[PDB]
């Protein structure tokens, strides 16, 4: 007789729906997922150096809150602030708290170098029962509470050069007494004043007497300030009362360091993308887990699924 | 064509003949390999790694603050809307083009076959050819393997076609 030759393509019983420019839903033979939407649940301790703050915030660890003394001279790629973190020291507050936390988190090191300050005329190492360390009262480990010696509080005019080849971060403070009685009884003057300055920069705080709400016994406060000193530039501290002196400097670095808030446990495994919800793999180009991201990550998108067609149109009968 | 052949499980494109000896089904490999090679290169472009980003800005907050919080929020919101649209457009184009290239690959297999059977066959319109000459399992595989000469069956096939 004769012969018949037929051409065609394959198909499958159940194919996958995908989107095109015109059609909203359209069956093809296979598709792959372009949006990562799941997380193991834990943060991976490699390749990033993760530092679990536990009960400490970065600032507390920075300052020297007693239960945060374990975090001394510490380093991180990513600092993790747990939500159970508390403060157990002198009641403080930081103007521009966000900026301090950030600039420190980026530096990634609490490497502190003590310096030889000389406070002739006043009594060093002041302490408090709101900041218990060991058996009795205490303070922030990186701060020096200065008070009168004898019947006097002389005017402090100390200076510290920066003669290294890096940048010095100094953390210091001022004291706000609840009453006038507490003010003169500690810093014999009636109104304090701190002026910390470099060559190019200058700031100066006047203390503010008044009652605050009772926290861990006290109704007085501390205000935390910072100053950065570049090489060649020089620090000058000037105060006739209420100063909270710096014991030295933190070293400043520039690298891929940061901080994140998360309650996900840390585990021993590998993963390059970190979210508050845990580590995720960055194989796919987009993720839907958390807009908060650290490391090599898929870009956060709103969709929870984007199917890339990985085959031809699927037409059965 | 008309529809696909769920019974093909060893390739993407292929032939089905009916002859004197029986009826057979064999998949064409090169055309399959061409469609796979493309869709593969596609994937290589989309999975092609990501961008490293470390210390960014804060994206959650505990306290109302006004202006700056407002800006920090709006900036991230804008960014997400923009990468969302990009993602939504990406799959749409990639998919339309994926589909486009896979049925184009059929039309070059079919057009390759028609140019073989110069005029020893007519096309039914079926996605099939009526071959006007005796063609055993050895003959059609000469069509499959591209090794078919028409001058052989030309005198023969012109006959059945024309009367």
């Amino acid at each position, epitope marked *: 007789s004769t012969a018949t030759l037929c051409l065609g393509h394959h198909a499958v019983p159940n194919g996958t729906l995908v989107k095109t420019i015109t059609d909203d839903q359209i069956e093809v033979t*296979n598709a792959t997922e372009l949006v990562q939407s799941s997380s193991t649940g834990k943060i991976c301790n490699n390749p990033h150096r993760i530092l679990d703050g536990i009960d400490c915030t970065l600032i507390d660890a920075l300052l020297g809150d007693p239960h945060c003394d374990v975090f001394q001279n510490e380093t991180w790629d990513l600092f993790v602030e747990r939500s159970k973190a508390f403060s157990n020291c002198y009641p403080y507050d930081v103007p521009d708290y966000a900026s301090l936390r950030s600039l420190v988190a980026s530096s990634g090191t609490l490497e502190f170098i003590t310096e030889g300050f000389t406070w002739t005329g006043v009594t060093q190492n002041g302490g408090s029962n709101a900041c218990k360390r060991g058996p009795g009262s205490g303070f922030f480990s990186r701060l020096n509470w200065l008070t009168k010696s004898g019947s006097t509080y002389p005017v402090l005019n100390v200076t510290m050069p920066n003669n290294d080849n890096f940048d010095k971060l100094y953390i210091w403070g001022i004291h706000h007494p609840s009453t006038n009685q507490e003010q003169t009884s500690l810093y014999v003057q009636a109104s304090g004043r701190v002026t910390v300055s470099t060559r190019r920069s200058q700031q100066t705080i006047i203390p503010n007497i008044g009652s605050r709400p009772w926290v861990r016994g006290l109704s007085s406060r501390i205000s935390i300030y910072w100053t950065i000193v570049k090489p060649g530039d020089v620090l000058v501290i000037n105060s006739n009362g209420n100063l909270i002196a710096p014991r030295g400097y933190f070293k400043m670095r520039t690298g891929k360091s940061s901080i994140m808030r998360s309650d996900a446990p840390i585990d021993t495994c590998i993963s390059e993308c970190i979210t508050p919800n845990g580590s995720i*793999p960055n194989d796919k180009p987009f993720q839907n887990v958390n807009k908060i991201t650290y490391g090599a990550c898929p870009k956060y998108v709103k969709q929870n699924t984007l199917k890339l067609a990985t085959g031809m149109r699927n037409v059965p009968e | 064509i008309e529809n696909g052949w769920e019974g093909m499980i060893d*390739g993407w494109y292929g032939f089905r003949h009916q002859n004197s000896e029986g009826t057979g089904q064999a998949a064409d490999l090169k055309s399959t390999q061409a469609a796979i090679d493309q869709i593969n290169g596609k994937l290589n472009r989309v999975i092609e790694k990501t961008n490293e980003k470390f210390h960014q800005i804060e994206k959650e907050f505990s306290e109302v603050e006004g202006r700056i919080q407002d800006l920090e929020k709006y900036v991230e919101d804008t960014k997400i809307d923009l990468w969302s649209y990009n993602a939504e457009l990406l799959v749409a184009l990639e998919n339309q083009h994926t589909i486009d290239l896979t049925d184009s690959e059929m039309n070059k297999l079919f057009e390759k076959t028609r140019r073989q059977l110069r005029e020893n066959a007519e096309e039914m319109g079926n996605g099939c050819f009526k071959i006007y000459h005796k063609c055993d399992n050895a003959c059609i595989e000469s069509i499959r393997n591209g090794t078919y000469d028409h001058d052989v069956y030309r005198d023969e096939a012109l006959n059945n076609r024309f009367q």
Partner: antibody
Amino acid sequence: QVQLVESGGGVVQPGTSLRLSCEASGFTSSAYAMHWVRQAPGKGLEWVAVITFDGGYQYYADSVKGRFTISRDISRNTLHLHMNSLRAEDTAVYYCARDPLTKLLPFDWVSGGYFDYWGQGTLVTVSS
Amino acid sequence: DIVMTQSPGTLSLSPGERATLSCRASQSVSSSYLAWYQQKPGQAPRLLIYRASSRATGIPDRFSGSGSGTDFTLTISRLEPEDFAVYYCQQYGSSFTFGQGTKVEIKR
């Protein structure tokens, strides 16, 4: 940078089973096709197994089909090779390698890719 | 199953000479999808060429690949003492398959 580190070889008796592991550092394992390649002592290189980035397909050389299964652990970024019913011919050093090309691979006869990075090897001595 | 056939068994050349290795295939590859690996003794193999002619990152300019279809060659323009080793080739035109390897030794 990118690193492959294989683990868990040794002397083991014929017929028994044994699992090999490959730790991937420097890249996401799920973003690549991953291979096993072995080398009997003095002999040359022999391809053994492949797993797509998907985890979706697996293909094996005929000398180990049936007996060897290849797997990945997205969560630990690690690659495994489960060897069953071992024998003396299997005695080799087993490499873990990365494939920057193979992404889509839906038949056992399609194109693959070249081996970008290699681990350093773990030795499997199969003997009575 | 494409089989890869390398020649010769062993090379031998004096340092500074030009080397040239051959790889022939049992079928046509499928896109010059042919790679070349170097393997010093006691080391893992390191990749030299992919797609038959493209140098891998960090490979000196003296290694060059050529060929298409069935017959491929690897040319080493000048032979430095670091280049004496076993050279395998590998196709990925269909599945993955390895050559048997060409050792190039020193001709004293």
